[PDB]
Symmetry: D2
Subunit: 266 residues, 4 copies
Amino acid sequence: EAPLPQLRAYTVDASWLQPMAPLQVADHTWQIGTEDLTALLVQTAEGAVLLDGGMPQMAGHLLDNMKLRGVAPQDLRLILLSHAHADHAGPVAELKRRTGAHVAANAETAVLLARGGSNDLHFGDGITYPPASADRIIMDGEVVTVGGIAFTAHFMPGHTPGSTAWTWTDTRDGKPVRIAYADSLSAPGYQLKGNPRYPRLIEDYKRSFATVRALPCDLLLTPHPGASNWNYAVGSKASAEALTCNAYADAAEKKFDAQLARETAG
Amino acid sequence: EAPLPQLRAYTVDASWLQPMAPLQVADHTWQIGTEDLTALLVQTAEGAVLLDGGMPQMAGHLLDNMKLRGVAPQDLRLILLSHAHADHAGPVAELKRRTGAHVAANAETAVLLARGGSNDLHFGDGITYPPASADRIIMDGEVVTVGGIAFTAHFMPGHTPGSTAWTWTDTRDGKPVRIAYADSLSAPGYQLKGNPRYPRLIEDYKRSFATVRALPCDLLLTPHPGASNWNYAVGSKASAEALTCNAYADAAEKKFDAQLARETAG
Amino acid sequence: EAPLPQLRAYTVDASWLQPMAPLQVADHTWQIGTEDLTALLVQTAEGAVLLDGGMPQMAGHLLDNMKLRGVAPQDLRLILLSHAHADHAGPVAELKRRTGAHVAANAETAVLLARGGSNDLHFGDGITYPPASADRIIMDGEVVTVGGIAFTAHFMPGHTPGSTAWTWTDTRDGKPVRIAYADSLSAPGYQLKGNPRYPRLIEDYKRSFATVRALPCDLLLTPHPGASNWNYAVGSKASAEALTCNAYADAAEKKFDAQLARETAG
Amino acid sequence: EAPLPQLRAYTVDASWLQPMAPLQVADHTWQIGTEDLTALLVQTAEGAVLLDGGMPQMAGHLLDNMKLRGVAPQDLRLILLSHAHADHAGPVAELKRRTGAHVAANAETAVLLARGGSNDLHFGDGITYPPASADRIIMDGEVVTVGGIAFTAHFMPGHTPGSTAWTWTDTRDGKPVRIAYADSLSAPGYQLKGNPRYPRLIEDYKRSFATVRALPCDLLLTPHPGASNWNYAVGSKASAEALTCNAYADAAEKKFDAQLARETAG
Ligand SMILES: C=C1CO[C@H]([C@@](C=O)(NC(=O)[C@H](C(=O)O)c2ccc(O)cc2)OC)N=C1C(=O)O
Ligand SMILES: C=C1CO[C@H]([C@@](C=O)(NC(=O)[C@H](C(=O)O)c2ccc(O)cc2)OC)N=C1C(=O)O
Ligand SMILES: C=C1CO[C@H]([C@@](C=O)(NC(=O)[C@H](C(=O)O)c2ccc(O)cc2)OC)N=C1C(=O)O
Ligand SMILES: C=C1CO[C@H]([C@@](C=O)(NC(=O)[C@H](C(=O)O)c2ccc(O)cc2)OC)N=C1C(=O)O
Ligand SMILES: [Cu+2]
Ligand SMILES: [Cu+2]
Ligand SMILES: [Cu+2]
Ligand SMILES: [Cu+2]
Ligand SMILES: [Cu+2]
Ligand SMILES: [Cu+2]
Ligand SMILES: [Cu+2]
Ligand SMILES: [Cu+2]
């Protein structure tokens, strides 16, 4: 008789786990994750902010890169998240323990983060990571300020119920740069139509496409750089082919509409 | 350059995942886990109790065996735990969702269960499972009653800070049978001496050896059946060579004292 | 020198704490709360459901009324909530401990319930109650079924971020009765315009007015009976003057628009 | 017919809420609470530590006193607790939100803190406060270090299951001062004998008396200053009549033994 199957680990492409040196996005914003996973460090006078952290095993690499930027572990004051999946919020638990930073997230992301990604509406328990607790609950449009830099949350439910875009204004060449960190708009293997765990899934994606179009957006970044056409490996040319917020939302909606029709035919 | 390592899954010996039919221990107590992982079902007039559930992937098998015993999913009223490691408390989250049962545990096991086993004092994040919440906090010596069957908790810290033994009185051949479900007394790969995460580790193990000796104990069971010399596969002869509570505690202390001396010499 | 002020208790009108006998709403739906606080019991073949529980001190009275209906404590399987304020979700913690029932709520209500109502966006810590944990997270439009009776959740954010309406179909005189339990639409003392803790507060109220209008609604009930023109004290004539769902939403929007203009002028 | 009783607020003697200016205990240790509630600030080069915070309404006063000591809100790095009752851990939730400090506590205190003091083993829901989460779980004897100052936890269960004494070495007149912050040893209105919620209550108190006797103790402080014979109001003479650790434990045990005999006779 066959035994019950062994637990399967969440494996990803090697480029998602390929460390990279800090890549400057603007005067205070740096990509410090891996080549295929975004992790943004915003350095203020009163401490540092981290948006996403990638996979669980990236915690040490993030702290190494923070130190290359002159940010001691205890100088990290705040962790912000796009959504609480293992490949974006993986190391949050370990980062909280080692930095003393607080996590700000909306209620849906907080509840998912507190489950460690277990009981996913679409993936079940296949992408579990160490759970972490949110210290501040964020509402739609709420402003989070660290060192005088205002971060504004824009709810874009879909990929996860708590999917959030974060916008803030940096500088470059003495001119303002409105950075938009928009969450994923994919639905990989999701059941879209008549989903009992997510009955309004299609309506949420539709409004989220419109939300992404209206974001203040001089420079767009996404948790997966390829989604917005970044290439973190080519250095100072990484952002050359980056999409607008309008192009990102439009490309996402056509892929969504094609998958929706394919689901009807499958 | 080498990428960061992929996540490693918690793999175990095949016999830990080998399903078995319900094996009767006493008039109301059944082993319904696998051949090498204990999961005890106690059936009362007012519902069923489950002590431990084994690995995360055993949830369906447990519910199948409960149904073979005539226990519908919603008839499970209470889940009790020896300790909150992935191979004993793995399926607790899924069982709560599908049965409506409550979990009773002490504070140390509840805090570990709420982390999904992450941030283990000795194993780090290597044995993470879906986290679950305790509905009732139990003190040492406290009695938990379901259907008129009294379960008494005996704290035996060591293997985990929350390690607990559960005792209750069943019947067999019209005579009382005092069953003792004692937790693991192993320290596999632990640092025993001068452990900053567990400074009183040795003192706790010592008192726990004495606690196990004094348990009301006509029949001893352990989360790993081989620890108490059970053999779930040979059917009605499974308990023939089972150890006493005194023999279990004594065998454990000698292994502990030998490992302690080996640690001094290693 | 004056000392710091003593803690102030959450006091309410006496009629909110005036016990009443079970009042039948339909074949399986009963009001079992107080004269001015709704607490609905739906009795199925496979257990009972409770929607709201009123104040913290109502826990014993609810269990007394459940027993008058023939519902033993352990027969309560599910607790549903309009919103997690002290006067509607007060006794949830005690009810879970004594009945083994599970709580189903959306993420916003779960996070507020887990704080015991502390850190309210508008009331601060003035209405704290014993906190409780949600066992199942509910999405908008999701169906929750107990004993074959389907409960559908309709998010109506505003009074609280997690404010929810619950709809289900009962019977009476052999004919179907579509009951709508709609949450509060008041904003008592709220700052509506430019609220940093709730920047989209006005937009949420507006959509919630439209959501209430579109509910399947043969009979409307609200957490405060006077909001829908019930009078629980006059017995079998309690529902005579009850409002429609359209009249409730319209009366609420005019009060909201008048308060919004008064806020501009105050 | 009488209505259900209104909620009763946790009121205390005025002196528990009488603010006081910072009173220096040693080179880096200050009493910054009220006249009858201890709240200790330890200032290091790398941030500040707070042991206990008193009542919920003391949060603002604590931050005012921290600022008088030159400690900005975000400079508070760690909150430590004797036990999680409303008059000692009241403002922890608000302090975390406004300072970004982490809370370190054992599992029993963390579980009680997470309930906001509700479901007390002896007081029920009479002393509920805003709940807070522990960021680091502490074991017995574990060392917590901030700015090079080592804090050692000594479990003394009794007053609460998680009751903890904190010891550290400060300086004064160039000589070391071993400060012991020992928790309460009272059992006000407790049922000591055969308590189903706390069956080993008497054994825990007995061991805790011995634990307090053996503490490194040049200067003893307690959460209630009168328990160790401090008088915070008389300024630089506040510690003149302070008890030793041995005298405190002995005075507590005689009061405990007299109450135990009175309980047998009552
Ligand atoms: C579109 C993608 C690419 O896939 C990742 C995702 C889905 O969110 N899935 C995966 O990593 C795998 C996949 O989708 O095949 C996977 C592997 C194992 C498993 O059990 C579940 C999923 O991350 C969880 N994220 C995005 C995004 O846009 O964010
Ligand atoms: C003495 C044992 C045998 O090992 C299991 C244990 C340790 O508790 N470890 C393991 O399963 C593995 C092992 O110990 O080698 C393991 C594998 C991977 C890993 O990352 C960590 C541990 O269960 C977690 N339990 C007991 C017990 O007496 O309960
Ligand atoms: C419109 C009302 C009437 O008031 C209650 C409310 C507000 O939600 N407030 C109160 O009970 C008091 C009030 O509003 O004056 C109060 C008293 C003390 C306090 O610290 C805060 C509020 O319940 C919390 N609920 C509704 C509802 O529609 O649900
Ligand atoms: C010995 C005392 C004095 O009382 C406080 C206590 C008990 O811990 N109780 C009280 O404050 C009141 C009392 O004991 O009468 C009280 C008031 C209302 C209530 O509902 C419960 C208790 O704090 C909770 N602490 C200690 C200690 O040694 O720490
Ligand atoms: Cu994702
Ligand atoms: Cu992803
Ligand atoms: Cu183990
Ligand atoms: Cu094991
Ligand atoms: Cu309300
Ligand atoms: Cu109300
Ligand atoms: Cu106390
Ligand atoms: Cu006290």
